[PDB]
Amino acid sequence: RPYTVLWADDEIDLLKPHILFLEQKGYQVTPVLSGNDAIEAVQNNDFDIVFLDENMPGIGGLDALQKIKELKPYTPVVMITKSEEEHIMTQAIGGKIADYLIKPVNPNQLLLSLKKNLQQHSIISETTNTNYRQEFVQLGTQMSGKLSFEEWKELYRRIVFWEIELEQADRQMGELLEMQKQEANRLFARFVTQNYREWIAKPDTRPTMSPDLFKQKVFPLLDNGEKVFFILIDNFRQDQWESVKSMLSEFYTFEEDMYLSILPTAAQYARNAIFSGLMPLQIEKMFPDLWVDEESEEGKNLNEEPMIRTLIERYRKHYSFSYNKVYETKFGERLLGQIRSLSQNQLNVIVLNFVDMMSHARTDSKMIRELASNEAAYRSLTKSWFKHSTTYNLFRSIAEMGYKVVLTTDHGTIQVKNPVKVIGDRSTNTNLRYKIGKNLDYNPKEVFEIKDPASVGLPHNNLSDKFIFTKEDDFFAYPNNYNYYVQYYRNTFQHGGISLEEMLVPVITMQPK
Amino acid sequence: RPYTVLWADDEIDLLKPHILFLEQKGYQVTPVLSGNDAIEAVQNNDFDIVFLDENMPGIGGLDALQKIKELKPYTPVVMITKSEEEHIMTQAIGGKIADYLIKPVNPNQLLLSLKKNLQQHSIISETTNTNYRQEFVQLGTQMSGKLSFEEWKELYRRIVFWEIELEQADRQMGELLEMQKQEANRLFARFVTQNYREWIAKPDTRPTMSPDLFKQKVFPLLDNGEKVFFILIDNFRQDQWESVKSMLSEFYTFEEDMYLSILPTAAQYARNAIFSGLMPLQIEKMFPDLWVDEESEEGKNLNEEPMIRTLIERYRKHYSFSYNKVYETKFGERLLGQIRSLSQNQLNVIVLNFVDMMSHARTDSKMIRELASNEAAYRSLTKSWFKHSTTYNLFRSIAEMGYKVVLTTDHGTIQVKNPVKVIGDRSTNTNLRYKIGKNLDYNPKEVFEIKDPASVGLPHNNLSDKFIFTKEDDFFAYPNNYNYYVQYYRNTFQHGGISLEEMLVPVITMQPK
Numbered sequence A, B: 001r002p003y004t005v006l007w008a009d010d011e012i013d014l015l016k017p018h019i020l021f022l023e024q025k026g027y028q029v030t031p032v033l034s035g036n037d038a039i040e041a042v043q044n045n046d047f048d049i050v051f052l053d054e055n056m057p058g059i060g061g062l063d064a065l066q067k068i069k070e071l072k073p074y075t076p077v078v079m080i081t082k083s084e085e086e087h088i089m090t091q092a093i094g095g096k097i098a099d100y101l102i103k104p105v106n107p108n109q110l111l112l113s114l115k116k117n118l119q120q121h122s123i124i125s126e127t128t129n130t131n132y133r134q135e136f137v138q139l140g141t142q143m144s145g146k147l148s149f150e151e152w153k154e155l156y157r158r159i160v161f162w163e164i165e166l167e168q169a170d171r172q173m174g175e176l177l178e179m180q181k182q183e184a185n186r187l188f189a190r191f192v193t194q195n196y197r198e199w200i201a202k203p204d205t206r207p208t209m210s211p212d213l214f215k216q217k218v219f220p221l222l223d224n225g226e227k228v229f230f231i232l233i234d235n236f237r238q239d240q241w242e243s244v245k246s247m248l249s250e251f252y253t254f255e256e257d258m259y260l261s262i263l264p265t266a267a268q269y270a271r272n273a274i275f276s277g278l279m280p281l282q283i284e285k286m287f288p289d290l291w292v293d294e295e296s297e298e299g300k301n302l303n304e305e306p307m308i309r310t311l312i313e314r315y316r317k318h319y320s321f322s323y324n325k326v327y328e329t330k331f332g333e334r335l336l337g338q339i340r341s342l343s344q345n346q347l348n349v350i351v352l353n354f355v356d357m358m359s360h361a362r363t364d365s366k367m368i369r370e371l372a373s374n375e376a377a378y379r380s381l382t383k384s385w386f387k388h389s390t391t392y393n394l395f396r397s398i399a400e401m402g403y404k405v406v407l408t409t410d411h412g413t414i415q416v417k418n419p420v421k422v423i424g425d426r427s428t429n430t431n432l433r434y435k436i437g438k439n440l441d442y443n444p445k446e447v448f449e450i451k452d453p454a455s456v457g458l459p460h461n462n463l464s465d466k467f468i469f470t471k472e473d474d475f476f477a478y479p480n481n482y483n484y485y486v487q488y489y490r491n492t493f494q495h496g497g498i499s500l501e502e503m504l505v506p507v508i509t510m511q512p513k
């Protein structure tokens, strides 16, 4: 079927050359001479696009626009007029005009406007597929050759970008990236297993990790006299920052970067390392009060504010600061009300936990299994919360206050696929991406064995304790009810292990506009 | 602040007057001679917009665009070239260009695209605010007089339209419509309580209601030899339809309409009326084995496929039909996978329950309390579900199967606000918007008294039973721990009573494009 065009213009006869040209290109043009005729035509038909002229007898062009957008809000309306007035242009833009063309009109301009407003989705789709197939060989070739951390960053940023651009494409085109994604995870998995021990041993030569975050990305700005809001959104992947960055460009300049999470990828160690500036083991030694062991019943991140103080004082700084933790809407509302009473501190730290709460609810919540069945839904559901929670307005006010913002997280999360059999003490931790214990049977290769936790800067309730970690998208399953739990945990989001999603996380330094 | 423009063209010299015109109108313009110089400037500067000439030395104009979008995807780009080729248009469109202007370009045309690509949201907001006040007058006029059912449809449609249209505006602009909506609900409740008993007694004259839906909206299509998918999304408000119809306009054209759900606005009564074509009392009188009374705890809508068979038979029809109920996520994926097999039926009934489950979860799920805290969030969450669940690809597949779709619901829901004291019994039901009881104590002025359930086509277990319904945003609250349950149920979504959201519900007839 060919596309239909409704063209309303009292001088429609002067446009015969254009109309023949359009009919020549396969379009079915319907002419009328008044806006009343135009509205009636829209009432009784389903045109694909409407060309309107501003100056007509009787009803005006912009009035027909308003009435037409009430009847067919999804049908693009192009305004084609002699007038160059600024109030006419403005009103048309406000009337939701799809495009505005000033007479005299190049016939080829009409052609462009018809392609862009009737086929931009189908066109963008075929280009994206083409441009992806173009870059496919480079991707596999880019990762094939062993590469540096800085290159690993760009490789992942690239895969994320493609993962988002291909949400709309067909399965076949989706799977080509999944393979590349998981193959990258496999290759990234072994990449960290080779160097993780030496990053702990050699802090000078290592990449930025959780204990260095405040030192590399926060202290420079504070020392430079800049006022900062450090926003920690627990469990915020790279692709979740891509999903929300468009909302924030309206208020901020982005200085995007990434850093490496320590293992395990969970708040107990990675987030405590961030605010303390130390590895968990050094937290237990130097500050035994502030560390909470794994076997304890109490929460494991209740002493982040005092840790911040030790970090500030340990570096001989005298920053004024504040700490707020929003784990419940109503608390985040009160914070949004008193936000501007924090204008005195050089550093305001806000922790948001809903995304981690939601990521976990993907397992034990019927609601979130549906609303985040897949990663695209997960990202969309993340966008909805960012917008309609206090978070959006929170950023808006901070931008008004002139505070720079370092937006980052403590770890990501990954959709788990394959079970890894493990058996341990009943008192063994219940995390599915890492386990702590002594009497643990498993296959050493299938996991990432750490028999000397002190070397990787991790404390232990005993001193025969060993750490094991899943890699890629694996997850631990116990032989009891193995058939059941593997069903229950397949395709859920789990953090604590090793993967590009979990470890490679964004740290965005944002300047208000 | 004045907006920054980056213009890249090898013949920049010639475009100088265009630049003075832009710079005259308060636009900072930065000119480069090639993409390479353009690609640099974007990294080293935060530009508001880019102007890309296609044909330049070395770097391809389109290949620069591809880079700029990957660096600063949030920044619009306008292409201004002498090219009139089709693929350059196509490639530029596929590169996510904002506007494409053929040389020679009118200066006012460059002004047009600058207003339309850097301010559009602000202009639309002002126009929306202005236009609503002008229409606010008429709406007040429409409500002033006595209203027919058809006028109630049109009024409610326009309230919802402005409800969504004003999501992007100040609070006070939202409180004007809120007052308008509340007044509309008050009159509509008055309108229902005056005429409801007449409607059940005069089928030939009453407006379309639940037991009439199939004969009025489905059978005429099948009689005309059309293939119909009847999709009932439980608990789907007008504003929820309004939120998704953009997604569907890509594949269907719509004949939008609304009908009245019978009371109570609950699946047990309204939805069974739909599929049986009878009032609940008639379902019990004629098909007692298919009716499930209130006392029992078994599901109340488990015999809808038999009811459809009796409806087809009752009207001496010979339709081939299927019936599928989706509440699990996995089952929906199975249905989509096998959607083609339903091509052997004239009528395909699909029931989707998630939106109702989701709506109820707004009460007892701290997840949905956050994700659907307000009506705007409720709509945003319905949109993401529709898109990223199997529902989107279900309508997609149905259109490709040349099937006509009748999308509707059994009732809406309303955010409750004010309690209405009621004394009942352990036997009394738990619905917040209506009660059934032999001995109910309440203030008759705060409810709609049905002492004669049979007169409104309702069954009951005891001869002295009666029905009472809340109106507007009221909800029933029992005296014991009244204070706790008032604050607990306040601001939740509840259905079963009288309101525009609950009763005046959409029925869309859709034709595949």
Ligand code: BEF
Residues within 6 Å of the ligand: A053, A054, A055, A056, A080, A081, A082, A083, A103
């Ligand atoms: F008469 Be139209 F506005 F060119």
Ligand code: BEF
Residues within 6 Å of the ligand: B010, B053, B054, B055, B056, B061, B080, B081, B082, B083, B103
């Ligand atoms: F040289 Be450009 F493509 F006008």
Ligand SMILES: [Zn+2]
Residues within 6 Å of the ligand: A234, A235, A266, A267, A271, A356, A410, A411
């Ligand atoms: Zn965390």
Ligand SMILES: [Zn+2]
Residues within 6 Å of the ligand: A235, A356, A357, A360, A495
């Ligand atoms: Zn977590």
Ligand SMILES: [Zn+2]
Residues within 6 Å of the ligand: B234, B235, B266, B267, B271, B356, B410, B411
């Ligand atoms: Zn229902």
